[PDB]
Amino acid sequence: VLYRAVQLLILLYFVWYVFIVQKSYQESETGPESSIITKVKGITTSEHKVWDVEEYVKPPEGGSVFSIITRVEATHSQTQGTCPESIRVHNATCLSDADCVAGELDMLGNGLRTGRCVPYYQGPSKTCEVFGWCPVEDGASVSQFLGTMAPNFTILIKNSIHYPKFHFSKGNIADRTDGYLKRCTFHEASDLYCPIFKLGFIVEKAGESFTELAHKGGVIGVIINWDCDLDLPASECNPKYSFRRLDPKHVPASSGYNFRFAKYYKINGTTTRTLIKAYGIRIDVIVHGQAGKFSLIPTIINLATALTSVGVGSFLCDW
Amino acid sequence: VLYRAVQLLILLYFVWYVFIVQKSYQESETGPESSIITKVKGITTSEHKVWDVEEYVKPPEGGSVFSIITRVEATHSQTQGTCPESIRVHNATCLSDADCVAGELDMLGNGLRTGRCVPYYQGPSKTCEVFGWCPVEDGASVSQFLGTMAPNFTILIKNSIHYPKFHFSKGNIADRTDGYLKRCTFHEASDLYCPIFKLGFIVEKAGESFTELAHKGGVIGVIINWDCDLDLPASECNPKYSFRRLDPKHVPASSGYNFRFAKYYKINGTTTRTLIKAYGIRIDVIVHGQAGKFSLIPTIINLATALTSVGVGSFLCDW
Amino acid sequence: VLYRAVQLLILLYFVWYVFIVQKSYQESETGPESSIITKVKGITTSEHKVWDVEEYVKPPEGGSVFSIITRVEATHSQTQGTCPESIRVHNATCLSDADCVAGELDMLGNGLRTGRCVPYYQGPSKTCEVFGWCPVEDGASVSQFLGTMAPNFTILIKNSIHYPKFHFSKGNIADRTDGYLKRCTFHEASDLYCPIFKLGFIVEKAGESFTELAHKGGVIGVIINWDCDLDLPASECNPKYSFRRLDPKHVPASSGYNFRFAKYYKINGTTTRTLIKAYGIRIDVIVHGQAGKFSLIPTIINLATALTSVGVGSFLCDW
Ligand SMILES: Nc1ncnc2c1ncn2[C@@H]1O[C@H](COP(=O)(O)OP(=O)(O)OP(=O)(O)O)[C@@H](O)[C@H]1O
Ligand SMILES: Nc1ncnc2c1ncn2[C@@H]1O[C@H](COP(=O)(O)OP(=O)(O)OP(=O)(O)O)[C@@H](O)[C@H]1O
Ligand SMILES: Nc1ncnc2c1ncn2[C@@H]1O[C@H](COP(=O)(O)OP(=O)(O)OP(=O)(O)O)[C@@H](O)[C@H]1O
Ligand SMILES: *[C@@H]1O[C@H](CO)[C@@H](O)[C@H](O)[C@H]1NC(C)=O
Ligand SMILES: *[C@@H]1O[C@H](CO)[C@@H](O)[C@H](O)[C@H]1NC(C)=O
Ligand SMILES: *[C@@H]1O[C@H](CO)[C@@H](O)[C@H](O)[C@H]1NC(C)=O
Ligand SMILES: *[C@@H]1O[C@H](CO)[C@@H](O)[C@H](O)[C@H]1NC(C)=O
Ligand SMILES: *[C@@H]1O[C@H](CO)[C@@H](O)[C@H](O)[C@H]1NC(C)=O
Ligand SMILES: *[C@@H]1O[C@H](CO)[C@@H](O)[C@H](O)[C@H]1NC(C)=O
């Protein structure tokens, strides 16, 4: 009697919870192979200047990680030569030539001290003279904002995962002969397979301000989750998109994202460059995937564990 | 009697299957630390032009992901200025100046509309005038094929994995004083430790056409699997190379791989650029590794589980 | 009696080892989401030349993988044209025009053979003439060492991990209003949250020589481990930094790390370039993370397994 009832209870528990909920009856491959091919579109304008994708999207190869430049501090006509050192560099400020010694090379400085003391770019102060790429950015840079139309920029993310154990492959764009991808807007439900995202949409879904992230910069992750149950039709294994900032926002020291790159020229045989400090939004496309398909081995093993505890549950009910 | 036979059967099952097949007696580290150092070699020629690795391999730092450019659509002598808008842009075509309004900036366009209507690059049509990088690519581009000798290109992939738990490190190139790496060709068996692959070989092993992948572009994965059994000599833990396309081929919208980059110049003090749209093959080197080494803890734990079910198997044989 | 003692022993074993040591009572997420924002600082000087971060740090976007150039072999004034082929290329050396045939394009060569035989850059030898980027590097390159002050370079690594299951996020820089990050030096204990590392410090902690790694090049991994116990205060989940070389050092063929990039100019309307072969140290920032937080489900399941073997341990003590 109670032995039979205990049998029924222990069985029901095992069957239902373990198999139907923990999916103990399926072999699982956590971590697929993914390809991410990103393409940004959108043009923005500064003072008498039109910026295109080639200028703000760095790197340009169209991969999982890329930065959209929203603000630049550019120093033009830089050449090897002597110029006053940045006033922000330690021991820069000087009152006479005796206050600067020749040959010091601060790692945080902008060149090799010449031993002299020259007037600063903006008087009346004076700073130690250095040899290097001149003029220095902190005395000759001009700032441009090119993120006025960045929220209207778009980012097509092409993702294709693979499960080698299960030989399953699925992408995030459907095979449609119509011009869907040319006239579609991503939606979690209606347009899940239109992976074209507005930058403003991504920023909002991450709960951030576009003014703050366009001024200081930062990193937003585009997370794609493929939680696939391969015992069901492939129409069931769809992408899940999540947008969240990956860099700190409450920490003033670690908040922001900027980098420096230069464009090199040759004017009258002399190598000149334009140094650009770029504050922008780094977009990181993170792809997570877990797939499970029914296999007889896990089934038999976990059924054996189920019968095993059924037994002990019965013998303790006696004991 | 039958209790003894049941004991023998249950034991044999546990010992053989669990330990000898599931490797329950080994602690396993899934996912090593890998370094991938790729170097492409090969020169290809266009009309009165020889292309080298620096031109087609982008990025050039020699990492796990890189693109080999097989076809380019290059627009030369681009400068900020006014030019007819691409006829492919919406609302571009115009019949009089009244049909174009000043100040509109389409994100999918190529600049800021001037309010005028000018003759197109190829008559007799007319398109709205825009300010931006001019002339636009869709009216001044010239196409070059530089993949004629890409199948003969070679890709040296240097891989070195590490298992921190097991303090095991192995690379895919052997310590040989002879000039093996200068005269060797990869083979799955005879030359497994000559990781120099022809691009045509990679493309064929992926089951793709080099004409199709040289015209549209795409992504091929070079997957290296290190399934190491560290209870055996290190000579046993070798790489396994797999080649397969990672981007869709049956989906016209998501099929292909292209990117745009530019070369910037300064002619008479004016910043001019050459815009290049590059169709190429992206090579992705994916490294998978699983290692196991015998440990006493898993051994004792799984032996305890083995004896545990031996028991229940015996008590149910009674019951 | 002995049944009671056996009960006590089996229980103590299960409780202590399994829960208190194996953490069977916690759900665990292996592998977080991490953002790495690297910024190198430091200037180095060659013969009448000051190198800055923009010149040696490639790529410059500030990511997990980047290379610091310590030595360059630069070939200047390269243009499409005819020049002697490198003597190191097979079948290059020639004694008369009949020894070179027109049209051959060696993949390991530097251009298309013209059919002629011209004097080499350094006599008295002669080599087959080729068309391509000329002059070739092996006959016109000049070597510069720019790693004299690389050990004094610094690398700020900003890391922020996330556990989506546990909704936990922590970074490696603390929220301090003082100028700590401007005056701090990393220390495993006192300054764990000052993620600014000297390159020499990284190289030493990897057990390498800076002379050897500055001459040949190589790859050093900066591994950050976040082993977090989320049942404890967040002040307990701190980073663990490990430095180790990822590329082989005992294998002459696979030892080193170099890449080629070029700077393109236009002199008198002709596209000229400077080809640079860069030997440098590739810094790879690898982030590992494992987190566990107490959950009732694993607790009940593993407690059931504990009682299960307690039983069998008891029935075998009888049997
Ligand atoms: N960032 C984007 N926003 C909106 N639409 C895009 C974006 N990137 C690409 N597309 C469109 O979606 C399709 C996929 O782009 P893809 O690069 O594969 O083809 P394409 O037509 O060669 O690209 P392009 O638009 O540069 O010519 C193309 O039709 C393209 O116009
Ligand atoms: N893509 C490739 N195909 C064939 N052989 C290669 C390739 N890349 C490198 N090698 C050869 O294999 C060895 C490894 O190249 P590595 O870059 O480590 O040394 P290297 O001699 O300095 O390279 P390089 O050939 O540019 O001088 C070198 O001898 C090089 O000639
Ligand atoms: N490699 C480095 N070595 C030492 N200090 C650094 C390094 N990189 C950045 N810092 C300092 O630590 C802080 C973090 O740098 P971050 O780029 O976030 O801000 P920043 O002040 O805009 O950088 P920058 O120093 O280029 O102006 C800044 O105060 C910066 O001066
Ligand atoms: C440079 O800085 C140090 C430390 O503050 C200071 O002692 C020294 O006097 C400074 N240099 C000169 C020439 O004043
Ligand atoms: C995109 O542009 C429209 C105007 O065409 C504007 O209303 C909208 O706010 C823009 N998107 C932003 C800024 O999020
Ligand atoms: C621009 O496109 C819209 C939508 O097709 C159309 O209504 C409008 O008339 C077009 N512009 C002009 C000036 O025709
Ligand atoms: C490589 O070149 C040879 C001729 O030297 C040619 O026969 C072969 O087909 C090429 N490889 C390709 C195109 O796969
Ligand atoms: C080119 O190399 C091959 C192989 O060594 C050799 O047989 C041939 O004679 C060489 N070319 C000439 C013209 O000598
Ligand atoms: C950094 O510079 C100091 C001198 O200012 C020198 O003593 C030290 O050795 C350098 N770091 C190196 C080379 O590791």
Cβ–Cβ under 8 Å, residues A219 and A284 = yes
Which method was it determined by?
A: cryo-EM
Cis peptide before C164 (omega within 30 of 0): no
Check: CB of residue C110 under 8 Å from CB of residue B43. Answer: yes
CA dist., res. B140 & res. B145, Å (int): 17
DSSP designation for C316: H
| Amino acid residing at A217 | G
Ligand 6 contact via B93 beta carbon (within 6 Å): no
CA of A152 to the centre of ligand 5 (A): 6
- To the nearest 10°, the Cα dihedral for B207, B210, B211, B215? 110
Please give the angle made by the CA atoms of B228, B206 and B199, to the nearest 5 degrees: 95
CA distance C159 to C224: 9
Give me ligand 2 centre to Cα C130, in Å.
21
Note the residue count of chain B.
Answer: 319
Written as six digits, the tokens of C4 are 């009671």
Tokens of B163: 């298992």
Strand-strand pairing, A44-46 and A49-51 = antiparallel
On chain A, the residues whose CB falls within 8 A of the CB of C287 are: none
Contact A200, A155 (CB under 8 A): no
SS3 A156: strand
Per the CB < 8 A criterion, the answer to whether A260 and A277 are in contact is yes
Tell me whether strands C168-171 and C154-163 are parallel, antiparallel or unpaired.
Answer: antiparallel
Query: Cα B207 to the chain's mean position, in Å?
Result: 16
Give SS3 for A16.
helix
Helix (H, G, I), strand (E, B) or coil at A308: helix
CB pairs under 8 A between B and C: 113
Q: Which residue's alpha carbon is at the smallest distance from atom 7 of ligand 5?
A: A152
Provide the 3-class DSSP secondary structure of residue A116. strand
In single-letter form, the type of residue at position A281 comes to I
Nearest to B284 among A35, A50, A164 (CB): A35
Tell me the sheet residues that pair with C218.
Answer: C281
Place of tokens 């390269």: C78
Distance CA B255, CA B216 (A): 8
Q: Produce one character per residue of B82-101: b if its CB has 16 or more CB atoms within 10 Å, e if not.
A: ebbbbbebeebbbeebeebe
Question: Do residues A53 and A42 touch, judged by C-beta distance below 8 A?
Answer: yes
Q: Is the CB of A151 under 6 A from ligand 5?
A: yes
Q: Which residues of C295-317 are buried (b: 16+ CB within 10 A; e: fewer)?
A: eeebeebbbebbbbbbbbbbbee
Main-chain phi, psi angles of A11, to 5 degrees:
-60, -60
Q: Are B295 and B287 in contact (CB under 8 A)?
A: no
The four Cα atoms A75, A76, A78, A82 give a dihedral, to 10 degrees, of -70
Residue C128 in contact with residue C100, Cβ under 8 Å?
yes
Interface of A with B in 162-181 (CB under 8 A): 162, 164, 171-177, 180-181
Nearest C-alpha neighbor of B266 from the set C76, A133, A262, A267: A267
The burial class, CB within 10 Å (0-12 / 13-18 / 19+), for C188 is exposed
- Rounded Cα distance, C138 and C85, in Å: 9
Spatial separation of the C-alpha atoms in residues A68 and A281, rounded to whole Å: 5
Tokens of B299: 């051994």
* Residue B121 CA to its chain's centroid (Å): 38
Distance, CA of A44 to CA of A58 (rounded, Å): 15
Count the Cβ atoms, other than its own, within 10 Å of residue B180: 14
Quote the CA–CA distance of B52 and B61 in Å, as a whole number: 15
C191 in A contact zone (CB under 8 Å): no
How is C162-197 classified by DSSP, letter by letter?
EETTTTEEEESS---SSSGGGT----SSTTTT--EE
The DSSP code for C294 is: E
Provide CB contacts within 8 A for A63, sequence distance 6+.
A36, A37, A38, B65
State residue C213 phi and psi, 5-degree precision. Answer: -75, -15
Question: Using an 8 Å Cβ cutoff, are B110 and B181 in contact?
Answer: no
d(CA C319, CA C315): 6
Whether B277 and B72 have beta carbons less than 8 Å apart is answered as yes
Q: Torsion-angle region of residue B8: left (phi > 0), alpha (psi -120 to 50) or beta?
A: alpha
User: Measured between CA atoms, how close is A139 to chain B, in angstroms?
Assistant: 23
Nearest to A128 by CA among A154, A107, A110, A153: A110
Secondary structure in 3-state letters for C101-120: CCCCCCCCCCCEEEEEEEEC
Confirm or reject: Cβ of A299 under 6 Å from ligand 4. Answer: no
DSSP annotation of C226 = E
Interatomic CA distance for residues C134 and C139, integer angstroms: 10
From the DSSP assignment, how many helices (H) and strands (E) are in chain A? 7, 16
Q: DSSP per residue over chain B, as a string? A: -HHHHHHHHHHHHIIIIIIIIH-TTEEEEES-EEEEEEEEE--EEETTEEE-HHHHEES-S--SEEEEEEEEEEEEEEEEEEEEPPTTSTT-B-SSGGGS-TT---TTSSSEEEEEEEE-SSTT-EEEEEEEEES-HHHH-EEEE--SSGGG-EEEEEEEEEETTTTEEEESS---SSSGGGT----SSTTTT--EEEHHHHHHHTT--HHHHHHT-EEEEEEEEEEEETTS-GGG---EEEEEE-S-SS-TTT---EEEEEEEEEETTEEEEEEEEEEEEEEEEEEEEEEEEE-HHHHHHHHHHHHHHHHHHHHHHH-
* Chain B residue closest in CA terms to C269: B267
Task: Work out whether strand C196-198 and strand A126-134 pair parallel, antiparallel, or are unpaired.
Answer: unpaired
Residue A27 carries which side chain, given as an amino acid letter? E
> Across the strands, what pairs with B281?
B68, B218
CB-based contact A246 C152, cutoff 8 Å = no
Do residues C66 and C58 make contact, with C-beta atoms less than 8 angstroms apart? yes
Identify the burial level of A165 via C-beta atoms within 10 angstroms of its C-beta, where 0-12 means exposed, 13-18 middle and 19 or more buried. middle
How far is A223 from C3, CA to CA, in rounded Å? 55
Q: What does R_g of chain A's alpha carbons equal in angstroms? A: 30
C152 CA from centroid of ligand 9 (Å): 6
Chain length of chain A: 319
Q: Which residues pair with A243 in a beta bridge?
A: A222
How far apart, in whole angstroms, are the C-alpha atoms of residue B158 and residue B155? 10
How far apart are alpha carbons C55 and B164 in whole angstroms? 34
Of all protein residues, the one whose alpha carbon is nearest to atom 5 of ligand 8 is C91
* CA distance linking residue B101 with residue B126, whole number of Å: 15
Nearest to C230 by CA among C17, C35, C32: C32
Integer Cα distance of A293 and A29 in angstroms = 9
**Listed residue (A128, A131, A269, A274) closest to C47, CA to CA:** A131
Provide the residue type at B41 as one letter: K
Whole-number Cα distances in Å, B63 to A223, B108, B159, C150, C284:
23, 32, 11, 22, 11
Rounded to the nearest angstrom, the distance between the alpha carbon of B152 and the centre of ligand 7 is 6
The whole-angstrom distance between residue A63's C-alpha and the CA centroid of its chain comes to 10
Is the minimum CB–CB distance between B248 and chain A shorter than 8 Å?
Answer: yes
Domains, chain B, with CATH or none: 2-12+15-20+298-318 (no CATH), 29-75+140-293 (2.60.490.10), 86-135 (no CATH)
d(CA B115, CA B128): 7
Tell me which amino acid residue B113 is. Answer: R
CB atoms within 10 A of CB C58: 19
d(Cα A144, Cα A140) in Å, to the nearest integer?
13
d(CA C290, CA C287): 10
In angstroms, this model's resolution equals 2.5
**Can you read off the two tokens belonging to residue A57?**
């999207």
If phi over 0 gives left and psi between -120 and 50 gives alpha, with beta otherwise, what is residue B22? alpha
Long-range contacts of B233-241 (CB under 8 A, 24+ apart): B234/B168, B234/B170, B237/B168, B237/B170, B237/B291, B238/B192, B238/B193, B239/B159, B239/B172, B239/B192, B239/B195, B241/B186, B241/B188, B241/B197
Residue (of C211, C206, C199) closest to C246 by Cα position: C206
Helix ranges, chain C (H): 2-13, 22, 53-56, 137-140, 199-205, 210-215, 296-318
CA distance A283 to C203: 31
C131, two tokens: 């068309």
Which residue carries 């051959």 as its tokens? C104
Ramachandran angles phi, psi of C28, nearest 5°: -120, 135
CA atoms of C261 and C267, how far apart (whole Å): 19
Report how far residue C257's alpha carbon sits from residue C123's, in angstroms, rounded to the nearest whole number.
31
Collapsing DSSP states into helix, strand and coil, what is residue C302? helix
CA C164, C165, C171 angle in degrees (round to 5)? 45
* Count of Cβ atoms closer than 10 Å to residue C235 Cβ: 7
> Who's near B242: CB < 8 A, 6+ residues apart?
B221, B222, B223, B224, B225
Which residue has a Cα nearest atom 5 of ligand 6? B91
Which tokens sit at B178?
């002879």
Tokens of C15: 């409780």
Option in B112, B257, B315 nearest A37 (CB): B257
Chain C adjacent subunits, 3+ CB pairs under 8 A: A, B
